[PDB]
Design a protein around this ligand. Structure first.
Ligand code: HEM
Ligand SMILES: O=C(O)c1ccc(Cl)cc1
Ligand SMILES: [Cl-]
Ligand SMILES: [Mg+2]
Ligand SMILES: [Mg+2]
Length: 393
């Protein structure tokens, strides 16, 4: 009753061009079985959204990667937020929601916007740059570690650690084994910075520790919550901003509409998140036998959600393959949906908005002018190198 497919959604050939395989996954049925990894898969919008919003059956406390924490040891202590279910999830989630709250955004907006404007002006003096190293990576590196309150020493470990985290959600393929092997130095750096004495007062990390006073989290929980921000908060935005720049480079008509109304910057970024879906996939584990899409899934089974596919499902989206900065993006699943929906979404949108605003006001054209190279990761979709020539407005 359930179709069995041999597609490996963690293979390099899949990463290189996922869209044909994603349609095959959608059109095979509402639920598929992936023989390569012995997991169920859902790739249509309706089922992905349903699974995300059914946490009591599709749980996260057994891991949101392929590995089932009931069967194997986690490669690092479980995240207290991503890898927890309610009620354990609730108070840690509330702490991060307050640390990264609307009110908090007021305190960082001016500096984040100023750093974006300065970066774009700097790049316009060079003309010819790598939109990944020089923009998608350089900008978040210039604002986020400081907003976290990290010291200067050791920051070279941040992107390597995040790449490890996202590779580790995948299956035990070469990408994952190479990332986990000899990762101790990255783990040691991050774990050290999560301790209270190493976090600058006023930054996100120190603010997490300050919540230990309220009874929402204990002091021994705070380092792990800081770890969540250092795991999710940098590499995601790197690939989100890179996706937006890649979209604007490929769709000059949309760059021109953004230039004509810079207030579209926030939605242009949201549409880039839908269109590229920097976080491609996450898993859940069934807590009971459950019927999904006419398929009877047993207890304790991994279910792979194709977020990028759901964001391109023509059952839900008009012209899903087109980048449209005025699209009504509400309901996309690029930040998840439901109890675990990205708690850092306001930071991500702030960075993306202010960068796209700076481009909208300062740049007239973005031309790819060198070999484009893709970056392979079991969970993240994005580019390794995007050589572009920026023409000033
Ligand atoms: C474009 C950028 C980003 C994307 C595409 C993204 C994507 C996601 C997705 C899909 C989830 C849901 C996980 C699940 O359902 O299992 C999530 C959760 C989460 N994100 Fe983001 N994220 C981004 C930026 C950030 C930033 C900047 C931060 C921190 C500053 C952050 C921190 C978190 C945390 C802690 C969670 C777990 C929340 C929970 O389990 O309740 N993310 N993110
Ligand atoms: O480490 C964490 O909690 C974590 C890691 C990655 C994401 Cl996308 C969200 C949360
Ligand atoms: Cl760690
Ligand atoms: Mg260990
Ligand atoms: Mg010290």
């Amino acid at each position: 009753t359930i179709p069995h497919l041999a597609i490996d959604p963690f293979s390099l050939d899949f990463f290189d061009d996922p869209y044909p395989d994603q349609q095959t996954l959608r059109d095979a049925g509402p639920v598929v079985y992936l023989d390569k990894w012995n997991v169920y898969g859902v790739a249509r919008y309706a089922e992905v959204h349903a699974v995300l919003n059914d946490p009591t059956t599709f749980c996260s406390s057994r891991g949101v990667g392929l590995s089932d924490f009931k069967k194997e040891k986690p490669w690092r202590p479980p995240s207290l937020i991503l890898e927890a279910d309610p009620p354990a999830h609730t108070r840690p989630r509330a702490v991060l929601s307050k640390v990264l709250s609307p009110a908090t955004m007021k305190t960082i907006r001016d500096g984040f916007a100023a750093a974006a404007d300065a970066k774009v002006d700097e790049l316009l003096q060079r003309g010819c740059i790598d939109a990944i190293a020089d923009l998608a990576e350089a900008y978040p590196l210039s604002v986020f570690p400081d907003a976290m309150g990290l010291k200067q020493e050791g920051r070279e470990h941040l992107l390597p650690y995040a790449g490890l985290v996202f590779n580790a959600f995948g299956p035990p393929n070469e990408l994952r084994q190479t990332a986990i092997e000899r990762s101790a130095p990255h783990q040691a750096y991050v774990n050290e910075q999560c301790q209270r004495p190493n976090l600058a007062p006023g930054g996100f990390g120190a603010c997490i520790h300050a919540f230990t006073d309220t009874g929402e989290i204990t002091p021994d929980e705070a380092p792990l919550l800081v770890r969540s921000l250092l795991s999710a908060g940098l590499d995601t935005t790197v690939n989100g901003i890179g996706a937006a720049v890649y979209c604007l480079a490929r769709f000059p008509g949309e760059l021109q509409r953004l230039r004509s109304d810079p207030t579209l910057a926030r939605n242009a970024f949201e549409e880039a998140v839908r269109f590229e879906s920097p976080v491609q996939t996450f898993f859940r584990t069934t807590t009971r036998e459950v019927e999904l899409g006419g398929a009877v899934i047993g207890e304790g089974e991994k279910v792979l959600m194709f977020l990028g596919s759901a964001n391109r499902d023509p059952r839900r989206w008009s012209d899903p393959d087109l980048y449209d900065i005025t699209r009504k993006t509400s309901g996309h699943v690029g930040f998840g949906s439901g109890v675990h929906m990205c708690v850092g979404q306001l930071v991500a949108r702030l960075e993306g908005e202010v960068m796209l605003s700076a481009l909208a006001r300062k740049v007239a054209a973005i031309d790819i002018d060198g070999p484009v190279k893709r970056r392979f990761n079991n969970t993240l979709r994005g580019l390794e190198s995007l050589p572009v020539k920026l023409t000033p407005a």
